[PDB]
C-alpha cells in the first residue's frame, strides 16, 4: 500500500528539492513558441535539480462544479508532454502541478459549497467528479510521461474540510500514478490539513514577510516533526516590487513600482533560516514564464521571476552551496 | 406570538423608487392582500463573497428618512412591521456564499472584520426598529456560509438586544431549519420556504418535527414563486425563465403551500416575497414575470387564505 514517514516506500521512488516552477499560467500558444524551449535552457543556470510543470484548468465561479481543461487558451496534452520530455532531457526531475483557477478571478482558495446537500444547488459530489476527472487526466499523463512526482492540488483551503474527499481522490489517484504525492497547502496552513498521512510528501506555498522566517521555521518544524513527513515549499518567492516582501503572494501588489532589492532580501532571509536541516526537503521556487523577457528589460520587470535580478545569484550560490548540494 | 399573514416591500431598497410618488400607491395597494404585517426589506453591499466593510445608507441605498416613511406608513395602514435590512454582493454572488477562512491568516480578510462590519450595519438598523416601534427585526437572510460561526453570531444577537427590544428572527435558507445549532438566541426561528410544487406535505411533515426539536415559534420569512414557465420547480431561483409568463405556476404554488401549511399551532404564518415600490400597471400584470403577485391569480388564492376561516382565527 502507501502509509509511509520520513521516506516515502520505495515503490513511489527522498531527495531535496532546487526547483523552479515553469510555463504559469499554462497557455498552449506560449508553450508550444520557440521562445519556450530557450526560456527553459535559461531556467537550469540556476542549477536547479526540479521543475514544476504548472498550468490552469478552469471553472467559472468560485460555486460552479464543473472544471474545464485542455480546451483553448489552455496547454494541449501534447504541449504537457513537450515541457516535460524537455526538462527531464535538461536533467531535471518533474513535478506536474494541474491547478484549477476560476474565470472571475476569484482566487481558488474560497472555492467552496454548502456543507449541506441541498436540491436546487451545486453539491461537493458535483464539484469533487469534475476535479477528479482534471486531476485523474493528469495523474494519467504523469505516470506516461515518468514525471517523478504530482501535486494533487494548490491552496484549495475551502476544500481542505472535505477530508473523506480528498482521501477518495487520493485513492483513485494511487490507482493510476505510481510516483510521489504531494498536496500544496497554503501559507500558515501547514497544521490545517487533516489528512496529511494520504500523500507522500507535505509542502506549502512559504509567501512568508520578511522579517518572519526565524519564527516561521521554528513553527513549521514543529509541524513536520507532528506529521512525521517529508516537507518542502511547492511555492516560495516574492515579486521585484516596492515592499512585495510583506505580502509575498500578493501578485497584483504595486505593480510596475520595481525593487530589485526587496526580492533579494526575501530570498537571502528565506535561505538564512531553510537550508539543509534535515527534516526539510527543500524549494520550489514561484516561478518562470514560458516567454521569457530579454536580460536588458530584467531591470525593469516587476514579476516573480528572478531572471536578470540579483536574486537570481542569491538563488544559484544557495543551490551549488556544499551544505545544500550534499542533501 | 402572532399569526403572520405578510408581505415584503421594498426590495432591493432604492432610494429613488421609495421617495417617488409611486411608492405610497404601491404600499397601500399591498393591503388589499389582506395582510397584517409587512416587512420592510431592503439592501446593504459588499463588493465581494470574501470582502470584509459592508456599505449601507449611501446612494442608491435607502435613506434614514426612507426607511422611516415606509415603516410610519405601514404602520398607519394597520400593519406590523418586520424590518429586514439584507447584505447584497456588489459582483452579483448570492449572499448565502459570503466567507472567510476558519483560520485567521494575517494577509486575508477575517471573520472578526466582516462581522465587526455586519455588527455595524445591523446595529444601525436595529436601533432605527428600536426608534420606530418596528415590532420584528430580521437580523439576517439565508447567510448559510456564515450560519457555523456561532459565538459571532451570538455576540452580535447580545449587542442587538442591548439597543433593540422587540420580537427578533433570523432567516435561514430552504432546507436548513434543522442546520442552525444557535435557535435559542432569537425568539422566532424562521426560513425562505421556496419548496418545489410536489414537495410541500413533505417538507410539512419535516419542518413539524424540527420546530417540535426545538419547542420556539416559526415562520416562513420569505415564500413566493415568480409567474414564469417551470418556476414552481425552483421558487427560489429569481433569474429562471425572465419573460417566459405563467401566471398560473404562481398560482399552483401557492395553493399548494397553502393546502400543507395554514393553522398548526407550532405554525405563525408567511411573510411573502414579494412586492415592489413601484408598482408595475394592473393592465401589465398578465405579462410581468415578477414574484410580485399584484393583478394575477394568485393574489386571490392570498387574499381568501388570509381572510379563511382556518386563518382568521390565528
Known amino acids: 500500500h502507501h502509509s509511509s514517514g520520513l521516506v516515502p516506500r520505495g515503490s513511489h521512488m527522498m531527495d531535496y528539492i532546487k526547483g523552479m516552477t515553469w510555463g504559469w499560467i499554462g497557455n498552449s500558444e506560449d508553450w508550444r513558441s520557440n521562445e519556450a524551449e530557450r526560456s527553459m535552457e535559461e531556467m537550469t543556470n540556476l542549477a536547479i535539480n526540479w521543475t514544476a510543470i504548472a498550468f490552469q484548468g478552469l471553472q467559472e465561479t468560485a460555486h460552479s462544479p464543473d472544471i474545464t481543461f485542455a ?55 458535483q464539484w469533487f467528479k469534475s476535479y477528479e476527472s482534471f486531476m485523474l487526466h493528469y495523474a494519467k499523463l504523469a505516470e506516461d510521461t515518468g514525471c517523478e512526482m504530482l501535486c494533487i492540488g494548490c491552496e484549495m483551503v475551502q476544500t481542505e474540510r472535505r477530508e473523506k474527499e480528498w482521501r477518495d481522490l487520493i485513492q483513485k489517484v494511487r490507482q493510476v500514478y505510481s510516483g510521489i504525492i504531494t498536496y500544496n497547502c497554503d501559507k500558515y496552513q501547514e497544521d490545517e490539513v487533516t489528512w496529511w498521512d494520504a500523500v507522500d510528501v507535505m509542502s506549502s506555498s512559504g509567501y512568508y514577510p520578511i522579517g518572519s522566517w526565524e519564527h516561521h521555521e521554528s513553527r513549521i518544524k514543529k509541524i513536520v516533526e507532528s506529521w512525521q513527513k517529508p516537507f518542502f515549499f511547492m511555492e516560495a518567492g516574492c515579486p521585484s516590487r516596492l515592499e512585495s516582501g510583506s505580502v509575498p503572494n500578493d501578485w497584483n501588489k504595486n505593480r510596475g513600482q520595481i525593487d530589485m532589492d526587496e526580492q533579494r532580501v526575501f ?61
Open 267 to 327: 530570498y537571502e532571509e528565506m535561505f538564512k533560516f531553510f537550508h539543509g536541516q534535515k527534516w526539510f526537503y527543500g524549494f520550489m521556487l514561484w516561478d518562470w514564464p514560458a516567454k521569457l523577457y530579454r536580460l536588458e528589460d530584467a531591470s525593469e520587470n516587476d514579476d516573480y521571476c528572478v531572471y536578470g535580478k540579483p536574486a537570481a545569484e542569491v538563488i544559484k550560490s544557495f543551490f551549488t552551496s556544499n551544505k545544500i548540494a550534499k542533501r
Open 71 to 125: 480546451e483553448p487558451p489552455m496547454v494541449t496534452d501534447e504541449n504537457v508532454r513537450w515541457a516535460i520530455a524537455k526538462a527531464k532531457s535538461l536533467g531535471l526531475s518533474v513535478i506536474l502541478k494541474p491547478i484549477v483557477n476560476v474565470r472571475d478571478g476569484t482566487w481558488r482558495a474560497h472555492i467552496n459549497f454548502f456543507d449541506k446537500d441541498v436540491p436546487c444547488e451545486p453539491t461537493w459530489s
